[PDB]
Design a protein around this ligand. Structure first.
Ligand code: CLA
Ligand code: CLA
Ligand code: CLA
Ligand code: CLA
Ligand code: CLA
Ligand code: CLA
Ligand code: CLA
Ligand code: BCR
Ligand code: BCR
Ligand code: BCR
Ligand code: BCR
Ligand code: SF4
Ligand code: SF4
Lengths: 106, 64, 163, 40, 80, 141
C-alpha cells in the first residue's frame, strides 16, 4: 500500500467547452437532428460509456464528487448567511414559543 | 454516358421518399443496366440516419 | 356608457372594494411601530392601492354590478365611447413586437443557410450577426410587403409532400 | 479566448443573457410607472 | 404466420440477415444490383415479428417489410 | 452441407448445476430444440436462460424450448469463441429436423443452390390500393 499519482494528465483550456459532445464518439461529429441535444445532456455523466478504461472512470468520479461538496457548502453557507442578515434569529431566541422563524424576506 | 453527370444536383420524384421534391448531389452512376443506378447524397438525414440512396433515371429530374 | 355598465367613478361597489382593501392594511399596520420598516412597506402598499383605484376611474373604465372594471373589444364601440386603449390599441402594440421576432429569426435562418455547416450556427450562434438583424428590424412591415409584392417570400411547390 | 467567446456563443449562455434582459426590462417596467392595465 | 416481403430496392447489404435471430432471412444471387445479391424469406413460419430486419435496411424506404398477421405458438415466442 | 449431420442424442453436456429457465410441459408435448458444437478446450460461457456454465472439450449438447434461445447462443459462440454450431428441432413424435445451416453455409453468405422466395419485382410502395382487393385477402401479395 502506497501513494500513486500521475502528473499533468490533462491540459486545462476552454477548447472543449466550444466543442460539445467531445466525450462521446457519436456526438463529436455534430448535430443533424435535435435528438443530438437530448443525448448530450443525458450521456454527459455516464463515464462508463465514454471509455473502457477503469482508471479514467475513477479519476472522473473522484473529482466530480469534489464538485457536489462545493455545491453543498455554498448552499449551506447561504442558509447561515441568509439566516444572519435576512432573519429574526435574535428575536426568536428571546421568545421562541410565540415568535416563528423567517429566513426569506421578499 | 447513360445518365446525369458526376457532381450534378438533381431533384427526386419518388413519392415514397423522405427526399421528395428535394435536391441532392449525384455521387455516382452505374452503366451496367441496373434498375436503380443513380446514387445520390443529401445533407439532411432521414428518420433512420441515412443520407444516401440509389434512385432511378425516371425518378430524378433537373434542379428546381 | 354601453351594455348596461356604469363607469367606475360613479359605482358604489368600486368604492366599497377600495374601503375594504385599505381596511386590511390599516388593521395590519396597527401591530408595528410608526418608524419601523414594516410600517414603511405597508404605507407604500397603501399609497399604491390608493393610486391604482383613482387611475382606473380617471381612465373612463366601465365597472359592472360586481364592481370590477370590464373591457370592450369591438373597435366601433371602443372608438365611439372612448375605450380604445383597453384592447384595440394593445393589439397593434403586440403585432409590431411579434412581427419583429419573426422577421429577425427568418433572416438569421436564411443567411446562415447560405454558408457551410448551418447546423453549427443554430447551436452556436453568430452573435454579431444576430445583433445586427435585431437592430435592423424596426421597419419590419416595410420589408414584408416589399418581399410579398416581389414574390421572394413564399416557396413554390419545391416542398416535400407525402402521398 | 477565441474558444471562450465561442463557448459564450452557445445556445444555454446566449439564452441566459436574453432572459436577464427581457425579465430585467419587464420587472423594471413594473417598478417604475407601477401596475399598468389600460394604456392611457 | 407473419408475412415478410422484400422489394426491388435491395442492394445486398446482408444487414437484415445478420440481425433477425430466428434465421428467417437468407441471401440469394441476383442480377439487379452491384453486389449481385438479394435477400429472401423462405421460412416465415419461424418469424417472431420482432421487426429488427426493417431497422437494418439502410435504403430511403424499406426494401424489407414484416406485415404482421395471424399469431401462433412460434410467433408469440412462447417457451410454454 | 455435403450431407445433413444426423443427431447423436447421447453426447456429453456442459457442467451446469441447473436453473428455472429450463424446459416446461410444452417441450414433451409439442416440440423442443437442441444445439450441438465442438470446442477445443474447457471454457465458461453465459447461458441464455440462467447463469454461467462450463463447456467440455469435444462435442457438447443442450436442450431448449425456443429457436431464439438457440440462435442467441450461436451468436455468442461465433463471436466470442469463433465456433460453428448447428441445431435441430425435435418433435414429440421423435421426428428430427435440421434447421439453421440448412445449406451448410450460413445465411449471410451467398450460395448457388439457393432459390428466391417471397421476392416482389417492384419497388416498395407502387402497389395496388386495398379497395382493389377489398373482398379477398392481401394488398402486398
Ligand atoms: C424537440 C423539439 C424541439 C427542440 C428541442 C428545438 C430546439 C431549437 N429550435 Mg426548434 N422547432 C421545433 C422543435 C424543436 N426545436 C418544431 C416542431 C418546429 C416547427 C417546424 C421548430 C421550428 C424552429 C425554428 C423556425 C427555429 C427553431 C430554432 C431552435 C433552436 C433555438 C435556440 C434559441 O432559441 O436560440 C437562443 C435563444 C434566444 C432567445 C436568442 C435571442 C437572441 C437575442 C437577440 C440576444 C440578445 C441578448 C443579449 C445578447 C444578451 C444581453 C444580456 C445583458 C442584459 C446582460 C433550438 C436548438 C431556431 C433556431 O434555428 O435557432 C436560432 C429557429 O429559428 N425551431
Ligand atoms: C482522515 C482521513 C480521511 C478523511 C477525513 C476523509 C474524508 C473524506 N473522503 Mg477520503 N480517503 C482517505 C482518507 C480520508 N478521507 C484515504 C486514505 C483514501 C484512499 C485510501 C480515501 C479515498 C477517498 C475516495 C475515493 C473518496 C473519498 C471521499 C471523502 C469525502 C466524503 C464526503 C462525505 O460524504 O462525508 C462528509 C463530507 C465532509 C465532511 C466535507 C469535508 C470536506 C473537506 C475538504 C475534507 C478534507 C479532509 C481530507 C480527507 C484531508 C486532506 C486534505 C489535505 C490533503 C489538503 C470526505 C470529506 C469521497 C470524495 O471524493 O469526496 C468528494 C470519495 O469518493 N476518500
Ligand atoms: C367579427 C368581428 C366583428 C363583430 C362580430 C362586430 C360586431 C359589431 N360591430 Mg363591428 N367592427 C369590426 C369587427 C366586428 N364587429 C371591425 C374589424 C371593425 C373595423 C374597425 C368594426 C367597426 C365597427 C363600427 C364602426 C361599428 C361596428 C358596430 C358593430 C355592432 C353592430 C352590427 C354591425 O357591425 O353592423 C352590421 C354589419 C353588417 C355587415 C356589432 C356589435 C356598430 C356599433 O357601434 O354598434 C352599436 C358601429 O357603428 N363595428
Ligand atoms: C424565427 C423563428 C420562428 C418563426 C419565424 C416561426 C413562425 C411561425 N410558426 Mg413557429 N416555432 C418556432 C419558431 C418560429 N416559428 C420554434 C422554435 C418552435 C418550437 C417551440 C415553433 C413551433 C411552432 C408550432 C407548434 C407552430 C408554429 C407555427 C408558426 C406559424 C404561425 C405562427 C405561430 O403561431 O407559431 C407559434 C409560435 C411559437 C410556438 C413561439 C416560438 C418561440 C419563440 C417565440 C420564437 C423563436 C424565435 C427564435 C428562437 C429567435 C432566434 C432569433 C435569432 C436572431 C437568434 C408561423 C409562420 C404554427 C403553424 O404551424 O402555423 C400554421 C404552429 O402550429 N411554430
Ligand atoms: C448547467 C445545466 C443546464 C441546463 C439546465 C440546460 C438546459 C437547456 N439546454 Mg444546455 N448546456 C449545458 C447545460 C445545461 N443546459 C452544458 C454544460 C452545455 C455544453 C456547453 C450545454 C449546451 C447546450 C446546447 C448546444 C443546447 C442546449 C440547449 C438547452 C435547452 C434545451 C432546449 C429546449 O428544451 O428548449 C427549446 C427552445 C425553444 C423551442 C425555443 C427557444 C426559446 C427558449 C426556451 C428561450 C431560452 C431559454 C433560456 C435558455 C432559459 C434560461 C436558462 C435556464 C437553464 C435557467 C435547455 C433549457 C439547447 C438550446 O437551444 O437551448 C435553448 C441547445 O441547443 N444546451
Ligand atoms: C433592461 C434591463 C434593465 C433596465 C432597463 C434597468 C434600468 C434601471 N435600473 Mg436596473 N437592474 C436590472 C436591469 C435593468 N435595469 C437587473 C437585471 C438588476 C438585478 C441586478 C437590476 C438592479 C438595479 C438596482 C439595484 C438599481 C437599478 C436601477 C435602475 C435605474 C437607474 C440605474 C434604471 C431606470 C437603480 C435605481 O433604482 O434607480 C434609482 C438601482 O438602484 N437596477
Ligand atoms: C395572455 C397572458 C397575459 C397577458 C395578456 C397579460 C397582460 C398584462 N399583465 Mg400579466 N401575467 C400573466 C400573463 C399575462 N399578462 C401570467 C401568466 C402571470 C403570472 C406569472 C402574470 C402576472 C402579472 C403581474 C404580477 C402583473 C401583470 C401585469 C400585466 C399588465 C402590465 C402590462 C405592462 O407591462 O405594462 C406596459 C409595458 C409596456 C408598454 C412595454 C412592453 C412593450 C415593449 C416595451 C415594446 C398587462 C396588461 C401587471 C399589471 O399591472 O397587472 C394588470 C402586473 O403587476 N401580469
Ligand atoms: C452552469 C451553466 C449554466 C448556468 C445557468 C444558470 C445559473 C441560469 C440562471 C439564472 C438565474 C436564476 C437568473 C436570474 C435572474 C434575474 C432576475 C431574477 C432579475 C432581476 C432584477 C430586477 C429588475 C430587480 C429589481 C429590484 C426589485 C425586484 C425590487 C426593488 C429592488 C431591486 C432593484 C433589486 C448555463 C446552462 C446557462 C450555461 C452552461 C451551464
Ligand atoms: C399605469 C399608470 C400609468 C400608465 C402606464 C402605462 C405605461 C400604460 C400602459 C400600457 C398598456 C398597453 C397596458 C395594457 C393593456 C392590455 C390589456 C388590457 C390586455 C389584454 C388582453 C386581451 C385584450 C385579450 C383577449 C383575448 C381573449 C379574452 C380570448 C381570445 C384571445 C384574446 C387574447 C384576444 C400612468 C402613466 C398614467 C402613470 C400612473 C399609473
Ligand atoms: C381587427 C380587430 C378585430 C377583428 C379582427 C378580424 C375579424 C379580422 C381578421 C382576420 C382574417 C380573416 C385574417 C386572414 C388571413 C391572414 C393571413 C393569411 C395572415 C398572416 C401572416 C402571414 C401570411 C405571415 C406573417 C409573418 C410571419 C409568420 C413570419 C414571416 C414574416 C411575417 C411577419 C410576414 C377584433 C375585433 C377581433 C379585435 C380587435 C382588433
Ligand atoms: C440549489 C442551488 C441553487 C439554487 C438556485 C435557484 C433556486 C434559482 C432560482 C430562481 C427562480 C425560481 C426564479 C424565478 C423567477 C421568475 C422571474 C425572473 C420572472 C419573470 C418574468 C417576466 C418579465 C414577466 C413578465 C410578465 C408580466 C410582468 C406581465 C405580462 C405577463 C408576463 C408574465 C410575461 C444556487 C444556484 C443558488 C446555488 C447552487 C445550488
Ligand atoms: S437490408 Fe435491405 S438493402 Fe440490405 S440486403 Fe436486405 S433488402 Fe437489400
Ligand atoms: S420479423 Fe423479426 S424474426 Fe422475422 S425476419 Fe424480421 S427481424 Fe427476423
Amino acid at each position: 500500500v502506497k501513494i500513486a499519482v500521475d502528473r499533468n494528465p490533462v491540459e486545462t483550456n476552454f477548447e472543449k467547452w466550444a466543442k460539445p459532445g467531445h466525450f462521446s464518439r457519436a456526438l463529436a461529429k455534430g448535430p443533424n437532428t435535435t435528438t443530438w441535444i437530448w443525448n448530450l445532456h443525458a450521456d454527459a455523466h455516464d463515464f462508463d460509456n465514454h471509455t473502457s478504461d477503469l482508471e479514467e472512470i475513477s479519476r472522473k468520479v473522484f473529482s466530480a464528487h469534489f464538485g457536489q461538496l462545493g455545491i453543498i457548502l455554498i448552499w449551506l453557507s447561504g442558509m447561515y448567511f441568509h439566516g444572519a442578515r435576512f432573519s429574526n434569529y435574535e428575536g426568536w431566541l428571546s421568545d421562541p414559543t410565540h415568535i416563528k422563524p423567517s429566513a426569506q424576506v421578499v | 454516358e447513360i445518365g446525369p453527370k458526376r457532381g450534378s444536383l438533381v431533384k427526386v420524384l419518388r413519392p415514397e421518399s423522405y427526399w421528395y421534391n428535394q435536391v441532392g448531389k449525384v455521387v455516382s452512376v452505374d452503366q451496367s443496366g441496373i434498375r436503380y443506378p443513380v446514387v445520390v447524397r443529401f445533407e439532411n438525414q432521414n428518420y433512420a440516419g441515412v443520407s444516401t440512396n440509389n434512385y432511378a433515371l425516371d425518378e430524378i429530374e433537373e434542379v428546381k | 356608457d354601453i351594455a348596461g355598465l356604469t363607469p367606475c367613478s360613479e359605482s358604489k361597489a368600486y368604492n366599497k372594494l377600495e374601503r375594504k382593501e385599505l381596511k386590511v392594511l390599516d388593521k395590519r399596520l396597527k401591530q408595528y411601530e410608526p418608524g419601523s420598516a414594516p410600517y414603511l412597506a405597508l404605507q407604500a402598499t397603501k399609497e399604491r392601492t390608493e393610486n391604482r383605484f383613482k387611475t382606473y376611474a380617471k381612465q373612463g373604465l366601465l365597472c359592472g354590478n360586481d364592481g370590477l372594471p370590464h373591457l370592450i373589444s369591438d373597435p366601433g364601440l371602443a372608438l365611439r365611447f372612448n375605450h380604445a386603449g383597453e384592447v384595440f390599441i394593445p393589439t397593434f402594440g403586440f403585432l409590431y413586437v411579434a412581427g419583429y421576432i419573426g422577421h429577425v429569426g427568418r433572416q438569421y435562418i436564411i443567411l446562415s443557410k447560405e454558408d457551410a455547416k448551418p447546423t453549427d450556427k443554430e447551436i452556436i450562434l453568430d452573435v454579431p450577426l444576430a445583433l445586427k438583424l435585431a437592430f435592423q428590424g424596426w421597419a419590419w412591415p416595410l420589408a414584408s410587403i416589399q418581399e410579398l409584392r416581389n414574390g421572394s417570400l413564399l416557396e413554390k411547390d419545391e416542398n416535400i409532400t407525402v402521398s | 479566448m477565441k474558444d471562450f467567446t465561442t463557448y459564450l456563443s452557445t445556445a444555454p449562455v446566449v439564452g441566459l443573457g436574453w432572459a436577464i434582459f427581457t425579465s430585467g426590462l419587464l420587472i423594471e417596467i413594473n417598478r417604475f410607472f407601477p401596475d399598468p392595465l389600460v394604456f392611457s | 404466420a407473419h408475412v415478410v416481403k422484400i422489394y426491388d430496392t435491395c442492394i445486398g447489404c446482408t444487414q437484415c440477415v445478420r440481425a433477425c435471430p430466428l434465421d428467417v432471412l437468407e441471401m440469394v444471387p441476383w442480377d439487379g444490383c452491384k453486389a449481385a445479391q438479394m435477400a429472401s424469406s423462405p421460412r416465415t413460419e419461424d418469424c417472431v415479428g420482432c421487426k429488427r430486419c426493417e431497422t437494418a435496411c439502410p435504403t430511403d424506404f424499406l426494401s424489407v417489410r414484416v406485415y404482421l398477421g395471424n399469431e401462433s405458438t412460434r410467433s408469440l415466442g412462447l417457451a410454454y | 452441407p455435403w450431407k445433413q449431420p444426423e443427431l447423436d442424442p447421447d453426447t456429453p453436456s456442459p457442467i451446469f448445476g441447473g436453473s428455472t429457465g429450463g424446459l416446461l410441459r410444452k417441450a414433451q408435448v409439442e416440440e423442443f430444440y437442441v444445439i450441438t458444437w465442438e470446442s477445443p478446450k474447457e471454457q465458461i460461457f453465459e447461458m441464455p436462460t440462467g447463469g454461467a456454465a462450463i463447456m467440455r472439450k469435444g462435442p457438447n449438447l443442450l436442450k431448449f424450448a425456443r429457436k431464439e434461445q438457440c440462435m442467441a447462443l450461436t451468436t455468442q459462440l461465433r463471436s466470442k469463441f469463433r465456433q460453428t454450431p448447428c441445431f435441430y428441432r425435435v418433435y414429440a413424435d421423435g421426428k428430427v429436423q435440421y434447421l439453421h445451416p440448412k445449406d451448410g453455409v450460413y445465411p449471410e453468405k451467398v450460395n448457388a443452390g439457393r432459390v428466391g422466395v417471397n421476392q416482389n419485382m417492384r419497388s416498395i410502395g407502387k402497389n395496388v390500393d386495398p379497395i382493389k382487393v377489398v373482398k379477398f385477402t392481401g394488398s402486398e401479395p
